[PDB]
Amino acid sequence: VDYNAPLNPKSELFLDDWHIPKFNRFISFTLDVLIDKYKDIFKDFIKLPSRKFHPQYYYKIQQPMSINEIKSRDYEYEDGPSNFLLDVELLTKNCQAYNEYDSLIVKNSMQVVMLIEFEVLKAKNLKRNYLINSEVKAKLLHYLNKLVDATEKKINQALLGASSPKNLDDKVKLSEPFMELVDKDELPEYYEIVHSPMALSIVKQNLEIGQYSKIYDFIIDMLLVFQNAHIFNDPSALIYKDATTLTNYFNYLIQKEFFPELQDLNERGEINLEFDKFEFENYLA
């Protein structure tokens, strides 16, 4: 287990210099909410495994970790955000080091980390977590369609420019297997493992009808679609690779095209950017 290596070294959670005010209060508040919401997923990660019954665990694992331990720690200092995230990621790193990779407990450990990091992502971005009004919805829809229509050639052109590989397919939509959920009767194990299923057709319908209140509500469901493929499938699987590619392309669209377009339009007085701040700082109390 490499503690210092982020699971995703290019995530904005690691690249951006962010801090949340009263971060300790944020952390315990947020973790408690998740524990209550996802009781079955989280229950195995609240306490460290007993020393008395787990000798080989404490042989194998250099930095034992639990949600209780994280809740007990201080993160209100410069490197706090990164240390918190790395402490959280130990929850799955240690589990993967100790148990069989395919195990339910390992898949659960990954979803614990994913759900925690989704809450951090929302909180880190209060400054730009605008209300989805008519204008914002229209723009999000275009970017969603751009992602859905993306081919290997287009994505690589966007991400790598002149450094893109040369052969690349410009026909097949990488989105295809993410559009619809698998039939529950054909693959019941999917629903036993993946606890919050999501598919791109569903996210699009949600956006079209106004089910997402704020930008990051939409963003998280999009990330959930791709991350669930990383949970269910082996890293060696082609779909796992495509999930990575689509995650990176989506993040590129949001950061490099979508948010800059909102800023340009706002500066030119062509868009209203507003907030619903309900519970933005609920953790402060």
UniProtKB/Swiss-Prot annotation:
Name of the protein this chain belongs to: Chromatin structure-remodeling complex subunit RSC4
Misc note: Present with 8570 molecules/cell in log phase SD medium.
Cellular location(s): Nucleus
Full-protein residues shown: 36 to 320 of 625
Residues annotated as domain Bromo: 18-123, 146-257
Subunit text: Component of the two forms of the RSC complex composed of at least either RSC1 or RSC2, and ARP7, ARP9, LDB7, NPL6, RSC3, RSC30, RSC4, RSC58, RSC6, RSC8, RSC9, SFH1, STH1, HTL1 and probably RTT102. The complexes interact with histone and histone variant components of centromeric chromatin.
Entry function: Component of the chromatin structure remodeling complex (RSC), which is involved in transcription regulation and nucleosome positioning. RSC is responsible for the transfer of a histone octamer from a nucleosome core particle to naked DNA. The reaction requires ATP and involves an activated RSC-nucleosome intermediate. Remodeling reaction also involves DNA translocation, DNA twist and conformational change.
The organism's place on the tree of life at top rank: Eukaryota
Residues modified to Phosphoserine: 164
